[PDB]
Structures are given as structure tokens and as C-alpha cells.
Design a protein around this nucleic acid. Structure first.
Lengths: 49, 147, 68, 211, 95
RNA sequence: GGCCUAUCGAUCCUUUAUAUUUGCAAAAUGACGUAAAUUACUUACUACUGUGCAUAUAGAGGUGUCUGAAAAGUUACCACA
RNA sequence: GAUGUUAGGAGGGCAAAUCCGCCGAAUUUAAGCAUAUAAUUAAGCGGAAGAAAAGAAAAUAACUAUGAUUCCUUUAGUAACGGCGAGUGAACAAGGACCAGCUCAAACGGUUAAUCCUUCGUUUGGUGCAAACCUUUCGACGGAAUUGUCGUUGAAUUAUUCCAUGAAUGCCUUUAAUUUGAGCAAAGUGAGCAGGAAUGCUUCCCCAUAGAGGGUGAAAGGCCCAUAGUUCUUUUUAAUUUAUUCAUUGGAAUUUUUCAUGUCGAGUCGUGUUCUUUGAGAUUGGAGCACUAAUACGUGUGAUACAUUUCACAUAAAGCUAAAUAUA
């Protein structure tokens, strides 16, 4: 029988959280990655917009 | 979790990694820690020796804060001081740094390590080791007993 | 609790509230306070002070966070 | 138990399954608490609902250095302030009746804190436009221009929070102003040893005094 | 261990008078009732038995008296206190 | 220790030995010892400080189903695995 | 003490998730079993509420001390308890949520109980369509109670400073929040193709602060209800705005100076004993019984039985109290 005892959540650590945001922003920066992610980048006129 | 489990490796396998001859049944020596000294004596002796018996007097309400002990070694005493400040003390022969170890959170100063030779320092603390005291005197520092 | 003088009187008046139905059977009387140990305070009352039921339930209770 | 495994210390032998609770209300409960206090403050005209504590010492050998918010100022500190108990209830200062005001240094610090609050405080007229000098060491009734001008501004509530202490404490001392004389380890052991001799002497002193 | 009001503490923080630097700042109507109530109530039989032992006044009887009083009232202190009341009554009785 | 190869027993407990080593939780029980002081809660300096209990270390008191349950019969009335 | 179908009132019973009391097991664990374990759990009998109970020190500390309650984080799987085996197991401190105080009772007031209540009445307000509620002081006539209600919180006395007070005239302005029901609420039912019939496919248009959702003859922003957005009307509770004169009576707080230094809950505590219980250990809490106290310079505490003495802290044996917190 399923019960609410189940470990649904997790502690995600502050330094790790910050790193993920910063690194994702840096990744968002990269033009090749934007296109690979499937964004239709062709007529854009700067690498971060 | 569920998709990587050992049961997923062994899914059609009867006893399934728990012994076909055995035919797997729960706690078959008896519950928990219970077989200790009796049936699991060999395990307890080999892995947890000093487990059985009664040793020492009793102290009925310990109250651990009464006997509280935050220590530092002399080795890390200088480390409570910044690098640039320490350089200024190294430069200036005429002065020494006062260090309030209690204001930095410590009560006892112990004797592990090195104090740099010919370099006075003033150490304020509740407790000091014999060795710590000897080092502080040896290097021309001062020790302050302080509450 | 019904009569006008006691309802009027600001003293004792609290007893007119409906929670005072069967005070002795909730053990709120001096006799009840005694056997529930409510006269006793301090470390002599340590396993009993918020109530015997209350204290035990608090001690029994296992409390888990969502992210633990 | 088997192999290298440590002995367990679980207490799940009793029927814990109806004596267990999991918190899924946390962040919403926090929101509700925020909402409740915000609503309360706003209802009080936006005026402070905060309580100003005395500064008091944390106890025993471990925490004696540290100082925290206490239960209430109590009569000696209030008398030093020039404030009544009734005034203390009327204003935001914390109240008590059995906290002794102890040593001089602590009392002197808390009366200074009271004086700081007393100087800080501005009191809105009781009946609005019927201004009086009034009771209890409470400020005399504010004028209409000032109170309106003050109302527009933020309240300054910094003093409620605990204070900080000396940032470096690395201070200089000249070589010839310190000495190498000291024997701290000896002093400690001797101090404990001579306690018995003193305790006996003090008991005899106490008897003599009492006589 | 005690700080002592007279003579301030040493900074060492062990032994007597030691720790952080600090400065410290530190009937008849009922009696008449009691005598009247005693006129009304007299003495309890155990109180009376103690009075007789005390009146005998020997070291054996006095030793017995404290034991008997401890046994009857509970506690050595209660027994001694009661014995003091009895001695006072015997002093009154003599005069 | 017995010419050699045999002649023996855990934890807990009890008991007697042993200690310039300890404890009984805010404190004390030699001894006001030795000095000074003398209006007194004076001021130093002292290895040896009540009963009782607890320890710590060392034996002994026993478990012969002898790596250690305090344990007699019975069922053709019987049941279950 | 009876008695009354006297006159006026009340209780009964139900419902139970969470709450509060009692009363109260065993399967189970130890690979056996007896102490321990399940567990002060289940069932049983009672009482409550939208929360309940608890709560204003016969408290914790031994500090540079803290200072009603509840709750969380923690101490802590620790001190401790245990065929010291299996197993069990707190509290204080610290960080916080949140915080609220008080009154009987003695004591004090006799050229007057200054109290209390029922019945009869009577008028200064305010709503509502109407029912009707809500304020409001003033007299009777009955009773009750001195076997003690009411006032007072040491006592006067000085200065200061507030609050109740009553009348006339003035005046109820503006907003901001907050919260109901209410409404209004953008563009295509455009070609063409195949189709039972588009909300499909195309293709020409567009609207979006509404491309949430639902319904609509196949997937709809533009078909409808809705939605986003707003216009009010509703809840209360803030700010703003406005009071001015004339009037008695009463109270309270500090502050002087004198004078009063009184007071503080008994078959209860305690002790013994027994049974129970716990962390309580030469007895933690409960309970039965036996013996049974001291009065505030007392006596209750300071977790190993005791005597003898310190020192600190508290004020039992009367009572109430919001909040955070819990809810199958």
C-alpha cells in the first residue's frame, strides 16, 4: 500500500543551485547551443539577444 | 529509482538471487540484535568487541554545557589572524598581536605544532596546556587567563 | 451557571461558559489537578506537565519534512 | 545482524504508523503567518506591533559571553528609565514582574536602552485634537504637522534586533609592555586545589556574619 | 562555588570567588492567637508523652524523645522543632 | 609448582584484598593547622579531612546439556505445521 | 429536612475525525520463558470544543546567569533505565514561531452593607417594509446575605498629571484598503478541396491585459457560455476631517514627608508503608492505608541513603486567562 511516508522531495544544495543557474546562463550565451536546443536562430543579430 | 533495481535484472528467476535451495524466509536466526552473545557471538566479538558487560560509576544528570570544551592548538592560533596583519607583525619587531581566542569562540589552547621563533604574541584564553604555556613563554609571548 | 447574580458578577463568571460542564470528570478541580499532577511543576513533572497524554504523544510523534 | 554492519538504534517496535506525521503545509503555513501579521499591522494603522526586549545574559560556562533578548524590563530598570509598569504595558517595551535586574552593568545597559527607546518614541494623541502632557513618562501629545509628516515615513525598527560586537580584536601591543612571568597551568591547578580551604573559611565567615 | 558579595571576583574562572568582571548592588497578634488556641486545644497525647519524657530529663529519655518525635512526626528536623516547643513549655511550667 | 602428555568455567552478581589514584553534581565535615592581623564576613599560606554508597584493579564463590535458560508428568479426547 | 401538576428556570439524549478524563488487555519480542517487551496501545465507560487542555513560579541555574504557557529546530538515541540480555530513554540550556496578564482568600473600611436578585414598571437613544432587536436612568414593591456581600491592596499627607464625568452650540467630510454577491466583457461562423456534418486541410483575413476551461454534428483565440480586464453595489477598519464653550462630581498614577511593618490556603504537606508508574536510580509521579507538621529570619527546592552546617532560588496545599498549535 502506497503511503505519504514516501520520500518525494530532496534537499538541493545552495552552492549547487547557484552553479546550475550561472552555468545555464553561460550555456544560454552560446550561439551553437541555442540552435542545437532547437531555437530558430537564423535571423538573430547578436549572440545573447 | 525503480527502473535500475536488482529485481529488474532478475525479474524472471524464481527465488531470484536469494537462493533456490534456501527458499528465502525472514530473520531466520531471530529478530534484530537478539542473537548476540548466544548465536552471533562470533560476529559481535570480531566486529564489536567491548559491547557486553557493565563498566564505570554513573553520573545521573550529565548536563554537557557545564563541562563544555572548545579547543584550539597553538599551530592554528596564528591562523585566526589575517595574512596582511600577520605580515605587519612580522615586519614590526616592536609590537605583538593580542589574540582573544574566546571572542573567536575557544576556551582551551593546546600544544600541537610550531610557533615561529623570535616573534611575541599575546594569547587570551580560559585554559592553556602545559605545552602551550611553555611555547608561549619560549617565543616571548604572553598568556592571559581571562573569563 | 444559569442564575442572574452569578452571570452578573464579574467574579466566578467564567464558570458560566459551557466548557465547565463536568469539570470533575475532566479533572479540573483541586482533586483532579492533584492526580493529574498539575500541582507539581519543574523536573518532578517532566514526563507529565502539558498533560500525560500530551507529553507522551509529543514524545511518540515522528515528524518528517517534505524534503526531509 | 550480520557482517560489518553496526547495531541498529531504531524504535519502530511500538506501533509508530498512527503516531507519525509528514509536513506538506510548510510554505503555505509560512505564507499564512505572514498574511496574519501583515493584516494585523495594517489594521493597527500600520503602527508597530513589535515588542522591545531587555538585553540579558545567556547562562552557564558555555554561553556566558553571549547576550540575548529577555522577558521584560522589570521595576528597577523601569524606575531608572522613569517609566511606570502601566506605561510599559501601554508602550512597546517588554513586561515582567519577577526577572531580577541583577548587576549594575546589565541594569545600566538596559536603562540606556530604555532611554534610547524613550527618546525615539513619538506618541499619537489619545483623542485626536485634544492634546495633553499626559502620564507615565510617556511623551506629551504630538502636533498635527509633525505626526502627519512622520506617518509618511518608514518606522525605524533596527533597535529591536540583537546587536553585533567588535569586528577585528587583533590589536597591537608593544613588546616592553608585556611580560613572560606568568604560569597559567600552575595557577589553574592551585585555584581548584585551594577551593576547599576557602570554602571552609567562608562557611566560618558566614556563621560569624550571621551571629 | 560562590562569587562573594564582599570582595569582587578574580578573572581566573576556577576556584572560589572567580569569573567575569562585575558589580553587584546588594509578631504579636498571631502570637496572641496561638496562646489562646493552646488554651482551647491543650496538648496532643504524643506532645504530652514528650512533655513527660522531657520532664524526666535524663540523657536516655531525651535521646528516646528525639527518636520518638522523629518516628511520630517524620523527619529529625520536625522532631527537634517540636522538642524545642516542649522545652519552652517546660520553662513556662517551672516558673 | 608437580619428568612429559590429563586434573577444568563467561557476562551480570556477591565477597574480601589493593591505591601521595577517584566520584556522589552550587557548597562544606582534618583543623580555624601554620603565620600575621585584631574595630572584622581581616589577610595569607598548608600532599595527607565524617558515616553510607559508587567505582577502578585482583582473586574467590558456578554454571559437568561444561563458548553458561530458574523448569516435572501426561493425551487411546486431541488439534496444527 | 420534608411536602407541592404552586411561579419561574436547568439537566437528560444524539453526533465523534481531532480534544479532555477515567477504566483498561493480549496476539507480539526475546529464535524457549518467567522480569522486561506489545503499552500507560486496542476495546470499555464518561466529558468537551471550533480548537481543547495547559498557563503567570513551593521554576531553571550555579552564569557576566535566566524568568507564565503552547509549538518547532535541537539536546538525543545522550545522561539514564534494563534477566545492564532482548531492549527502553528524558530534561535543561541555545536558535526560533509566538507571547498577556491577573483575583479569590487572609489583611484593611462600622455615628450604620457602601451589597445582590426576582416581580412591577418607566424613558434618552438607534436600526428594519414588517417582525423585531439594540442602547437607557429612574423609582417602587417583594425577597436574599452579616454563619460576610460590596469597596480597599500597607496607612495617612504633599505637590504634579491624567481619566471618567454633564449641558449648550458646532460636526460626521473625504478617501484608501479589505471582502461578498453582481454585471459588462476582443476578432470570421471568410474563399476553395475532399467530407454525413468542421472546430480538418488549404488560402485570404484578423484579435489578444481574453492562446485557462467547458460546451458546440471531426482537433475552435475569432460558434456559445466562460476567461483576462473592468464598472459598480456588499462586508469592516484604517487613515484623513472639526470641534467650541459652560458645569459639577468622582476616580487614578507618580512624587514628597511622616508612620505600618502586619500578611502568605492542614488529616494538607511530610514521613512510614503498601500497590502502581517513570528517567528516578537505597523511590519520579499517582493511589490506598498508618502516623501526622511548621508558620515567613517560616518551609519547599538544589536528581545516592544519612547526620551537622552553608549559600543560591522559590513561595504548595484556592482560582481564571487570548495567541501561536492539532484535526483521517
Amino acid at each position: 500500500p502506497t503511503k505519504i511516508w514516501r520520500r518525494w522531495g530532496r534537499k538541493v544544495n545552495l552552492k549547487e543551485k547557484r552553479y546550475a543557474v550561472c552555468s545555464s546562463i553561460a550555456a544560454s550565451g552560446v550561439t551553437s547551443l541555442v540552435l542545437a536546443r532547437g531555437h530558430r536562430i537564423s535571423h538573430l543579430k547578436e549572440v545573447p539577444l | 529509482a525503480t527502473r535500475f533495481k536488482k529485481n529488474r535484472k532478475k525479474r524472471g528467476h524464481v527465488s531470484a538471487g536469494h537462493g533456490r535451495v534456501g527458499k528465502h524466509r525472514k530473520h531466520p536466526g531471530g529478530r534484530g540484535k537478539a542473537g548476540g552473545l548466544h548465536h552471533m557471538r562470533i560476529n559481535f566479538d570480531k566486529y564489536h568487541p567491548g559491547y557486553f558487560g557493565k563498566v564505570g560509576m554513573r553520573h545521573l544528570n550529565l548536563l554537557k554545557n557545564r563541562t563544555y570544551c572548545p579547543t584550539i592548538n597553538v599551530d592554528k592560533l596564528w591562523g585566526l589572524l589575517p595574512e596582511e596583519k600577520k605580515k605587519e607583525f612580522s615586519e614590526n619587531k616592536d609590537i605583538a598581536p593580542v589574540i582573544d581566542v574566546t571572542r573567536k569562540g575557544y576556551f582551551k589552547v593546546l600544544g600541537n605544532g610550531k610557533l615561529k621563533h623570535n616573534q611575541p604574541i599575546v594569547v587570551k584564553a580560559r585554559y592553556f596546556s602545559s605545552v602551550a604555556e611553555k611555547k608561549i613563554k619560549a617565543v616571548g609571548g604572553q598568556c592571559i587567563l581571562v573569563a | 451557571p444559569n442564575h442572574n447574580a452569578v452571570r452578573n458578577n464579574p467574579k466566578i463568571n467564567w464558570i458560566c461558559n459551557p466548557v465547565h460542564k463536568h469539570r470533575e470528570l475532566r479533572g479540573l478541580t483541586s482533586a483532579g489537578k492533584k492526580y493529574r499532577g498539575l500541582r507539581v511543576k519543574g523536573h518532578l513533572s517532566a514526563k507529565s506537565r502539558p498533560s500525560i497524554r500530551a507529553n507522551w504523544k509529543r514524545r511518540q510523534l515522528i515528524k518528517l519534512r517534505k524534503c526531509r | 545482524v550480520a557482517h560489518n554492519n553496526v547495531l541498529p538504534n531504531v524504535h519502530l517496535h511500538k506501533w509508530w504508523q498512527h503516531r507519525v506525521r509528514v509536513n506538506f503545509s510548510k510554505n503555505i503555513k509560512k505564507k499564512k503567518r505572514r498574511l496574519l501579521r501583515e493584516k494585523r499591522r495594517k489594521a493597527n494603522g500600520g503602527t508597530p506591533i513589535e515588542k522591545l526586549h531587555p538585553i540579558v545574559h545567556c547562562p552557564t560556562q558555555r554561553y556566558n559571553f553571549r547576550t540575548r533578548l529577555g522577558k521584560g524590563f522589570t521595576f528597577e530598570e523601569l524606575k531608572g528609565a522613569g517609566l511606570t509598569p502601566r506605561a510599559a504595558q501601554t508602550i512597546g517595551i517588554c513586561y515582567d514582574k519577577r526577572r531580577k535586574n541583577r548587576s549594575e552593568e546589565s541594569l545600566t545597559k538596559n536603562v540606556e536602552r530604555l532611554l534610547k527607546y524613550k527618546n525615539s518614541l513619538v506618541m499619537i494623541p489619545l483623542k485626536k485634537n485634544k492634546a495633553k502632557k499626559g502620564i507615565g513618562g510617556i511623551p506629551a501629545d504630538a502636533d498635527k504637522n509633525t505626526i502627519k509628516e512622520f506617518r509618511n515615513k518608514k518606522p525605524l525598527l533596527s533597535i529591536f534586533k540583537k546587536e553585533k560586537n567588535t569586528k577585528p580584536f587583533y590589536e597591537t601591543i608593544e613588546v616592553s609592555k608585556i611580560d613572560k612571568e606568568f604560569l597559567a597551568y600552575k595557577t589553574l591547578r592551585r585555584a581548584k586545589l585551594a577551593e576547599r580551604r576557602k570554602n571552609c573559611r567562608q562557611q566560618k565567615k558566614d556563621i560569624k556574619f550571621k551571629s | 562555588g560562590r562569587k562573594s558579595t564582599i570582595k569582587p571576583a578574580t578573572g581566573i574562572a576556577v576556584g572560589f570567588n572567580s569569573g567575569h568582571v562585575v558589580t553587584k548592588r546588594n509578631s504579636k497578634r498571631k502570637e496572641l492567637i496561638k496562646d489562646v488556641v493552646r488554651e482551647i486545644t491543650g496538648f496532643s497525647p504524643y506532645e504530652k508523652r514528650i512533655i513527660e519524657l522531657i520532664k524526666i530529663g535524663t540523657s536516655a529519655s531525651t535521646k528516646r524523645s528525639l527518636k520518638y518525635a522523629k518516628k511520630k512526626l517524620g523527619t529529625h528536623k520536625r522532631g527537634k522543632a517540636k522538642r524545642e516547643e516542649i522545652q519552652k513549655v517546660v520553662i513556662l511550667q517551672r516558673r
